[PDB]
Amino acid sequence: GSDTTITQNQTGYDNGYFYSFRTDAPGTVSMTLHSGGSYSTSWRNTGLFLAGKGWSTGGRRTVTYNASFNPSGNARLTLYGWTRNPLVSYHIVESWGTYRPTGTYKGTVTTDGGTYDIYETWRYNAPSIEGTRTYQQFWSVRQQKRTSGTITIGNHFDAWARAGMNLGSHDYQIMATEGYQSSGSSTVSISEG
């Protein structure tokens, strides 16, 4: 056999890609780790989770992805990552379920054949890669959903910067499935280029 299914919070390297899996609802969501930059998720009556594959150190890399994205409820398909100094999480949202994410509107960026709305939000005394903190979240949210294509990450970062949304030193960067309460499944593949 060879793929691996996991159910407990962890990070690591699988098939040459970084991966992260986290939930507040153990036993309601799993991640199956496939060859290369690919994984699947399955969730049933869950809480919150985020799972994905990518890189332990993010940057401006152009990436390409393909996904099967099958939420019954609130979920997102997102190029997600973190920085430190300052502590920021960011989301380049390609598709979503019942709810389209929003925040304080800071403009648009047109890249990779689509136009994205830019938003800022804040998290308050919340989990982070640095423990309980208050920090910013940056968003690019595509104006129409899609489930495959190229993301020229640097174009997002540059648009954010023009709007005053400054990033720190990169931590991980993954093509994520995010969910809240839903049930559903996904299969996602990511690579550079």
Task: Please name the residues in contact with 18: beta carbons below 8 A apart, sequence gap of 6 or more.
Answer: 11, 12, 53, 54, 55, 56, 172, 174
Experimental technique, in short, is X-ray
Resolution (A): 1.3
* Alpha-carbon gap, residue 70 to 97, rounded angstroms: 8
Asked if 59 and 40 count as a contact pair (C-beta separation under 8 A), the reply is: no
Length of the chain equals 193
SS3 161: helix
Phi, psi (5° rounding) for residue 130? -115, 15
Q: Rounded distance, CA 157 to CA 92, Å? A: 10
Q: DSSP H helical segments within 55-94, as ranges? A: none
**40 φ/ψ angles, rounded to the nearest 5 degrees:** -125, 160
The answer to whether the beta carbons of residues 29 and 39 sit under 8 Å apart is no
Residue in 69, 32, 27, 22 with CA at minimum distance from that of residue 46: 27
Q: CA-to-CA distance for 145 and 136, rounded, in angstroms?
A: 24
Structure tokens at 147: 């489930």
Residue 170 CB partners (closer than 8 Å, separation 6+): 57, 58, 59, 81, 82, 83
Q: Counting beta carbons within 10 angstroms of the beta carbon of residue 19, is it exposed (0 to 12), middle (13 to 18) or buried (19 or more)?
A: buried
Are 67 and 191 within 8 A, CB to CB?
Answer: no
Q: What angle do CA 139, 143, 145 make, to 5 degrees?
A: 95
14 within 8 A of 53, measured Cβ to Cβ: yes
Residue 54: name the closest of 187, 158, 188 by CA.
188
Question: Domain limits of the chain?
Answer: 1-193
CA distance 111 to 83: 22
Enter the CATH code of domain 1-193.
Answer: 2.60.120.180
* Of 11, 13, 15, 18, residue with least CA distance to 3: 15
